[PDB]
Design an enzyme around this catalytic site. Structure first.
Site, PDB file in Angstrom:
ATOM      1  N   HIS C 186       0.892  -1.142   0.045  1.00 34.89           N
ATOM      2  CA  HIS C 186      -0.065   0.035  -0.225  1.00 34.89           C
ATOM      3  C   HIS C 186       1.003   1.383  -0.140  1.00 34.89           C
ATOM      4  O   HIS C 186       0.290   2.231   0.399  1.00 34.89           O
ATOM      5  CB  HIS C 186      -0.979  -0.048   1.266  1.00 34.89           C
ATOM      6  N   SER C 316      23.596  18.573 -15.636  1.00 35.81           N
ATOM      7  CA  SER C 316      24.145  19.878 -15.339  1.00 35.81           C
ATOM      8  C   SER C 316      25.061  19.722 -14.355  1.00 35.81           C
ATOM      9  O   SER C 316      24.874  18.707 -13.438  1.00 35.81           O
ATOM     10  CB  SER C 316      23.056  20.689 -14.862  1.00 35.81           C
ATOM     11  N   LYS C 322      21.164  14.077 -10.078  1.00 37.96           N
ATOM     12  CA  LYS C 322      19.948  14.110 -10.582  1.00 37.96           C
ATOM     13  C   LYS C 322      19.958  13.002 -11.904  1.00 37.96           C
ATOM     14  O   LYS C 322      20.773  13.312 -12.783  1.00 37.96           O
ATOM     15  CB  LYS C 322      19.189  14.982 -11.023  1.00 37.96           C
ATOM     16  N   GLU C 329      11.101   5.453 -18.297  1.00 36.12           N
ATOM     17  CA  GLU C 329       9.867   6.064 -19.008  1.00 36.12           C
ATOM     18  C   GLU C 329       9.712   5.446 -20.398  1.00 36.12           C
ATOM     19  O   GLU C 329       8.538   5.534 -20.790  1.00 36.12           O
ATOM     20  CB  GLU C 329      10.620   7.593 -19.062  1.00 36.12           C
TER      21      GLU C 329
END
Lengths: 454, 454, 451, 451
Positions: C186, C316, C322, C329
């Site tokens: 959950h 960057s 990141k 995706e």
């Protein structure tokens, strides 16, 4: 009944209807999920009862649950299975995504009824406990997927497959009966070279035979049961033999080939077996939609359509109403497949929590296809008959038999006859006679539809 | 009750339960379409009763139906609307594709009850006739699409739109309350530049506001009514004013802006208004699925997830159960849209005969979205709260605030700090101090999240 | 620049530098819809179908050896990639695929003519209908090409990539079999399991999907060729259907058989509706696996962060760490595509009438697209993501030990305080004097909690 | 043959004869999935977005006039079709569209450099990120390009073709307003209506669909540009969002506006989910119209045969009159495609997380495909079928008068016998001596039965 019975959990006291066997958890769920009208279907409630009955038996065998309590729980579950407690399951499909609330609904009903069977009462003073006794060795996380697969496999084996076989047999009988009736073919909706009505129906038969095989291929995966994986798939806190023993017990009491899932992480984290099995059901829906459409188009009329067959008239103009019910439920199965696919694609980590919705759609599709085949068979298919004069009128007025002339008068003259017939609105025979290329006796001897179907 | 009442139609005699108000046609349908468990929903039954009530009024105004019979039919319809006859409508969704059988179910129930209201009895000797009186001026072909649109428009106006507005207001209140709480952004599931919790919730608000407009745009087409087109759309055998008068009467008694459909051929041959209106509902489902997922992910934990917000705990570990019910019903709406699209694409010639299925799905989606928004609002949204310390812990441990240093120490040193923090598992502050590029007081003065959100 | 060809409708100009003929030219004038064309897999399957028909017609004495050999050589040139610009027709054409059947008949006839020392066009030495289409109808050719393309793509593209990805994840599951992590149900903290156990679920999913796909292959291997216009085979040699399926099996090395019922074979796309059912099952499984990977890798500081994945795109310099899960995706997007394609296929498959289903170009466009998406997506996800999955062991242990779930290990010996006061379980326990700094270390063993 | 470019990840060889750079090169290595690429409409919309951003950046003093003008000229070359082979990336890429954003940044930067007398690559005079991407994020650029492409395609392709087809069918409805034919309900003979009335239903369907599509346009006209990474617009000029929407409205002549809530604009594809809802409505209407046309034209002797349609494909000389309704088949197939595409879009639109929806390339691939299919399909069906619909008057009257439905006209004056004995209504009546050969002609008037 207006009178209540007060029960208490960690959130406080809550009133439950005094004439009901459920408890505090069921009451809280019913009060917090007042969404639409869809509830668990009887098949799923029964599968939950079977699951608890099997767990009680194994827990007793393993020395974890007393004989007196285990026997009382099994007797209460048998009452559910016998149809004595349908009004004890009030919860919506649209509940917690694991089915926890329906798991607890069964735990509470069985515990309170088992208490009565042992001379006790319902509620806080009951002799049997929903969690400690009825849910012993279990989690909602493995119980609910188990009940989903039990309900699905039994519905496929006991309702859908027998009705599919019955409809297939009827259409095979019709194919044999009409094996010698030549009719016009239709491709792109246009008149085409002939085939027999028996050959056309044999296509429907072969469709249904192929569908049965595809459905059968989906059954082994649905037979794998999650029970024993407990909360996250590891089986923490269970006896090493529990998973195999409970699958064995379910196999015995249902006479179906249930086995413990070889990977409990797959079994808890996905609804993959049902996504795949429903793929076979949407295949059946596409085949039935085509068969139903052929029947209603071939029966269209009585004077301004095709009219090659007649069907039973079940209502006091008469419409192909069985074909309409069947085409409508085939559309429903296609939509249900999308809902199932979205739920099945949406698991996270150790648990898929789209389960009530997936099983609601899956069991609905099984009822629709099983009962729709049963209804279409007895109220339409068994009574299909050819309109022999109409079949022959269409065949004789078509342009498509002209190729029978080629061996006798040559392609060029046969094509000239067909072109004249089409341009001038004549039969092939009238055009051929008008050109002086043959006699009427020659036409009747040469143009033999029974020699043009293989 | 075991006792029967014998009724006869052109197919012969048929027994009906003596304690029921339906007649021979309803009995034949119930006996021939034993398919699954789905029946007409109460909303549709009520819409059929409204349709008959309006027709009786107009037929009386036009001198076609006596005052005594028209008044009795309207009184019987009012009893249906008051909930007095729910068990008089036993028919499946999976029936004739025009809804003829449910049309006749309403005709028979109203005629038999109207007969009793006039001092008569039920059955062959009734004082009011299902076809000649209750169905006067009507066809199943225009009645059923009329009832479909009446039920759909009233459900959208009275249930769905009010619940959408309520949930939007709650989230707007939350957006304003949390307008100053800076939190980490997330794009691609990765830490990103900050925004306020109020700004993030304002996106949910704007979604719901846009959805309301799209739904509102769909209402004028649903308000067009087929009634008066009769069998094929020409209105053969009706008074020239009947179509306008009956739409006007429905508008009066429902307080909704019903109008007669400008083209009755479109109105009978398609379900296009409902295909389009359901497109707006599947848009709402996609927006709600996203909002529900943001809520349950932001509340995940209590220690190994995100944990930026808390939600009400409605069950006695606590799971985001309202979010689960909502995501599940959003999947259902997407499947229902496919079933509707297939039925809507499948009209032939003068009539679409996929209607029971289309309206079953459409009204289900409206119940699910309306009741799901109502439940999610009162049991989750009204109680969303920030976990302020956790929000700040995540913001301060992220690498994303480093750009606040650029104006003070330059991009190259800021990037060096972020690279060191990432490589060595340090906070930005610890990495900056370790390199000697600033003091702790400078860091605290320069790195101000409240200045980084616009 | 042009030559004048002829069909039953009259004369039409055709580009002199192309090998197609009048009917392909007319199709280009009448079906100018969107940009989707027949995929290479289908063009190749059509060429194989014509190659097999030519051989069988020669064996049966129906086509001369010189013409049959020239047709087979022209088909081999198509298979070798020499004629890709000769197949310009849209998917959105006649629903039987007639136009593309004629496209292949005309291209092969004109090229075969050249191979025999002749020219293209009206004076050609080989005829599209009389020679290249001999014994055939568009009605049975197009479904045959559909099944040839589908079966070969499943066997040669999809199944190998599925096996490769399964092997990678199996290796990861074994390597991480001892790494205990927090479970999540959950989305909430739950009892422990190993990272290897969690990955074993992904492996078992892929193993089950392989079996379901394998079960769909026998029906796809059934070929319509020999049913001719309506399924009766009127005017064809009695051995032709069996012989041409046998020849296709020989030249492709795949187990093609003649369809036992030609009426089912012509009137439906049922084998592909069923096979695509297994592919949408795979799409739902891959969606779940890809989502687990990207959520487990989320961060680097404000998500879950239990695994790292390869960084394939430049970032960057001011946002080190990141790492967008871009393979996940692409994969989740194509899984959504497979679900949509299934609906399109189901509508087409439900829509046959009488002797012929005429939704075929659309059905095969969707089916072959799903195969490319799933095969190439599994290849890309494997090479650029799955092979590089690694645990963040410190983060895994931090989440596991700071959670509240391990409290159950204290049952047989003797949490709210830890939760309400923001303490660890051990810190809350010691504070209550219910155990020590050695008893807790002894009794709370996560590695004993995954049995 | 190659030049060496650089990004944050290191050096990479790029084809010397191409205008893209390092990031596009890397994408070609990592996203080798299927064959679907960005459609021309989307590439053009991306170029327009960059052209508008360059102008606004120049107006705000953020970008030099020489660089901004060169970028705008390079974008105009893309719009003029001079660079189609510079956009090689798959749909199946990063879910924000970052890769295609960078593809346009690199192509425009390298071409702008050439226009300023410079070279392509490391030594370029214009920079993809610092200049072409100034004030922008992939996160707000890609949704902006999505909406620009969608709105322009609806306004310029789909709506004009819908209006053209509606006008054709309106003319047919008026021309056939007096032709009485048999109605059909449930596929069964039913009371009469005119052919013009039946066609008027198709017209009204298309008119209603136009309104529903028009209602979807205002939301699609809202643009994300200016929301930057997460919607706050951090580090952008306060006037930039309004200015760039205004510039897009000027250069496209369409009513683009800045999205009033940038968080909704970045986190969802909601405008496209809604707009595609109207397109699947149009698909259901076109399916019904196309089916009516092909069923009404079925025959030529064993179907309905009430209308004729143009014959566009050559037939066999021995089957004159077999006219396959091939435009109707292309149209029904593409309508099935739109329904599938809607499911793919709905799944992607439902799947946003937090600040960004990353299903975008897939959503826009489906959306723009549906627009091409519906626009081009309506054009093809109009030109090659609808304009040529004609009644078969003798067949219409034969079916009408030999049916049993006209018996109701005898009610106010005074069927089973006709049906059971195979007679006309008049023949059965005269045989019963219930009227004459003049009373029946007087009382049974189908033209009085469509009121």
């Amino acid at each position: 009944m207006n009178t209540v019975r007060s029960e208490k959990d960690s959130m406080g006291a809550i009133d439950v209807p005094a004439d009901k066997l459920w408890g505090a958890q069921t009451q809280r769920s019913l009060e917090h999920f007042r969404i639409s009208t869809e509830k668990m279907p009887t098949s799923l409630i029964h599968a939950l009862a079977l699951t608890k009955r099997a767990a009680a038996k194994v827990n007793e065998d393993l020395g974890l649950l007393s004989e007196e309590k285990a026997s009382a729980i099994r007797q209460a579950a048998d009452e559910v299975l016998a149809g004595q407690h349908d009004d004890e399951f009030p919860l919506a499909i649209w509940q917690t995504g694991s089915g926890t609330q329906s798991n607890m609904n069964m735990n509470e009903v069985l515990a309170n009824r088992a208490s009565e069977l042992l001379g006790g009462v319902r509620g806080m003073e009951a002799k049997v406990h929903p969690n400690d006794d009825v849910n012993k060795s279990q989690s909602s996380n493995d119980v609910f997927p188990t009940a989903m697969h039990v309900a699905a496999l039994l519905a496929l084996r006991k309702q859908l497959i027998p009705q599919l076989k019955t409809l297939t047999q009827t259409l095979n009988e019709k194919s044999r009966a009409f094996a010698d009736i030549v009719k016009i073919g239709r491709t792109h909706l246009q008149d085409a070279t002939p085939l027999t009505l028996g050959q056309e129906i044999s296509g429907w038969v072969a469709m249904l035979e192929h569908n049965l095989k595809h459905i059968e291929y989906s059954l082994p995966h649905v037979a794998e049961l999650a029970l024993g994986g407990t909360a996250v798939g590891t089986g923490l806190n269970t006896h090493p033999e529990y998973a195999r023993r409970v699958a064995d017990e379910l196999a015995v009491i249902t006479c179906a080939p249930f086995v413990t899932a070889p990977n409990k992480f797959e079994a808890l984290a996905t609804c993959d077996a049902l996504v795949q099995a429903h793929g076979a059901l949407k295949g059946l829906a596409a085949s039935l939609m085509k068969i139903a459409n052929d029947v209603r188009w071939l029966a269209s009329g009585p004077r301004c359509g095709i009219g090659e067959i007649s069907i039973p008239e079940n209502e006091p103009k008469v419409n192909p109403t069985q074909c309409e019910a069947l085409t409508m439920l085939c559309c429903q199965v296609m939509g249900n497949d999308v809902a199932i696919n979205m739920g099945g694609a949406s698991g996270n980590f150790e648990l898929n929590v789209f389960r009530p919705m997936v099983i609601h759609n899956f069991l609905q599709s099984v009822r629709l296809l099983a009962d729709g085949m049963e209804s279409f068979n007895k109220h339409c298919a068994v009574g299909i008959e050819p309109n022999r004069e109409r079949i022959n009128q269409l065949l004789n007025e078509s342009l498509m038999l002209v190729t029978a002339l080629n061996t006798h008068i040559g392609y060029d003259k046969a094509a000239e006859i067909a072109k004249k017939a089409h341009k001038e609105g004549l039969t092939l025979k009238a055009a051929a006679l008008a050109l002086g290329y043959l006699s009427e006796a020659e036409f009747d001897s040469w143009v033999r539809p029974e020699q043009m179907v293989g």
